[PDB]
Amino acid sequence: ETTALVCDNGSGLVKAGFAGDDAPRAVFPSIVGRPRHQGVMVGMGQKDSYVGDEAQSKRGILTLKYPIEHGIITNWDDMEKIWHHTFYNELRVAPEEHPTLLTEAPLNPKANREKMTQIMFETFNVPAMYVAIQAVLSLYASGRTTGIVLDSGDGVTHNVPIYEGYALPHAIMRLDLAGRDLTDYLMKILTERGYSFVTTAEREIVRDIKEKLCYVALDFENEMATAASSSSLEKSYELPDGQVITIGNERFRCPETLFQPSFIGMESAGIHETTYNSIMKCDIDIRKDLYANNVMSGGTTMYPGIADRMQKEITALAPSTMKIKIIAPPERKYSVWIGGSILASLSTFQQMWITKQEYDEAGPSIVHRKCF
C-alpha cells in the first residue's frame, strides 16, 4: 500500500492527511451551512449547501449547523457530505484505494461506531480503517507509554489512565463540558456588559474572541480582588462590522468554568478534581507515573495559563510527599493526529485493520470485537 489516510474526526474541527508527516494537510471547521434568504440575484450556480472554510467565509447569509453534539454524530447526512468534502476537495485523493484512520471519543454509543464504519464501507468503498480512542493517540504524540491523559476537545472532555502498555477501562471517566460549552457561557456572560450575540455568526465571533483573548485564572479570588480596581486586565477587540468592544473579568471568568462546572449549572467535579478522582480510582501502585505524567491534549487545553493552574490544583489535592509534573507540548492542537499518524506508520499495526474482505461476511458488528 502506497499511503494510509488518517482522519481525526474532531467535534469542532477536522484534521486530515497522510501518514508519516505531522503537518495537517487539511484543517477546517466541521460546519455545514444552509442559506436563509431569498437570493433575488440569480446566477453563477447558487449552491444549496456550504461546508468548511467556504461556509466559514460565507456565514454572513448562512445558518451554521454543527453535525456533532458532544462527540456524538447526529446529522449523518451532513457528516457524510463533510467526509465527501474532506476526501475530494481538500486532500484531492481517491478514497477507494487508501486505508483510513478514524478517531472516536471513549464511552461513545456503539451505534455511532457501527454506523460510522458501515457508512465508510458502503458509501466510500474503502479497503479498511481503525477506530482508536484519541487518548492513545495523545500518548503517542507525547512519545511516552505511561501516564494519565487529559483530553479536552470541543465537545467532550475525557481522561484515560494508561500504565505501561495496558489501559484501565474501569478508571476511564469523561465529562460533557468542553470548548463549545465554554463558548456558550462566554456568549451568555458578554450580555452583562450589553453586547448582543445570538446568531450563529455571532457565535463564531464569540468563539474567535475566546480564541485570541481568554486565559485561565491562577487564583480566582485573587484576580477578582485585582479586577475590583479594573485598570490593567481590561482588553479590547474589533468586531468584523467595525465597532470595537472591551472585555474585563469576562476574559478569564469563562475558562474558569472548567474548574467550577457549577457556573453552567452542572453538578460535576472540575477537570482537576476529576483527574484526581480518576487517578485515585487506579491501583495503589501505578499512581507514580499517573502523578508524574499528565499529558494534556486538545485545543481547549491551550489557554494561556491552564497548565500551571492544573498543576497547582493537583498538588494541593494530592499528598505533598511526591512530585506532580504536567506535560503540555507546544504542538498541543494536533497531538491526536500526530499519534494517529505514528500509529499508522508503525509496522506492527499493518495487520490490525478491519479489511473489507472480513467485513464481507462479519458485518458492521465486527468493529467492537476487533477494535476492543
Ligand X SMILES: Nc1ncnc2c1ncn2[C@@H]1O[C@H](COP(=O)(O)OP(=O)(O)O)[C@@H](O)[C@H]1O
Phi first, then psi: what are they for 185, rounded to 5°? Answer: -65, -40
Binding mask 128-147 for Mg ion (x = CB under 5 A): ------x-------------
Residue 196 site contact among a second copy, Mg ion, ligand X, none (CB < 5 to 8 Å, cut-off depends on kind):
none
Residue nearest to Mg ion (CB): 153
Question: Rule CB under 5 A: is residue 106 a binding residue for Mg ion?
Answer: no
CA-nearest of 147, 171, 145 to 158 is: 171
341-344 long-range contacts, CB within 8 A, separation 24+: 341/6, 341/17, 341/18, 341/19, 341/20, 341/21, 341/22, 342/140, 342/141, 343/101, 343/132, 343/136, 343/137, 343/140, 344/4, 344/6, 344/19, 344/99, 344/101
Residue 303 site contact among Mg ion, a second copy, ligand X, none (CB < 5 to 8 Å, cut-off depends on kind):
ligand X
**C-alpha dihedral (339, 341, 347, 353), degrees to nearest 10:** 100
CA-nearest of 88, 76, 91 to 4 is: 91
Residue 45 site contact among other proteins, Mg ion, ligand X, none (CB < 5 to 8 Å, cut-off depends on kind):
other proteins
* CA distance linking residue 22 with residue 338, whole number of Å: 6
The answer to whether 19 and 162 are in contact (CB under 8 A) is: no
Residue 117 site contact among other proteins, ligand X, Mg ion, none (CB < 5 to 8 Å, cut-off depends on kind):
none
Give the footprint of a second copy on this chain (CB under 8 A): 35, 37-44, 46, 58-61, 132-133, 136, 139, 145, 162-169, 199, 201-202, 205, 238-243, 283-288, 318-322, 343, 346, 348-349, 352, 372
The answer to whether 121 and 70 are in contact (CB under 8 A) is: no
Question: Rule CB under 5 A: is residue 10 a binding residue for Mg ion?
Answer: yes
Residue closer to ligand X (CB basis): 217 or 324: 217
- The piece of 46-54, 126-134, 140-148, 255-263 that touches Mg ion (CB under 5 A) is 126-134
- Minimum CB–partner distance for residue 209 and a second copy (Å): 13
Site for Mg ion in 145-174 (CB under 5 A): 153
- Minimum CB–partner distance for residue 45 and other proteins (Å): 6
- Minimum CB–partner distance for residue 289 and a second copy (Å): 9
Give the footprint of ligand X on this chain (CB under 6 A): 10-13, 153-155, 179, 207, 210-211, 214, 298-300, 302-303, 333
Residue closer to a second copy (CB basis): 45 or 330: 45
Give the footprint of other proteins on this chain (CB under 8 A): 45, 94, 123, 347-348, 351
Residue closer to other proteins (CB basis): 84 or 312: 84
Torsion sign across C-alpha atoms 263, 267, 268, 269? positive
Residue entry with cell 450580555: 191
Q: Give how far Cα 331 sits from Cα of 12, 65, 132, 301, Å.
A: 18, 28, 21, 11
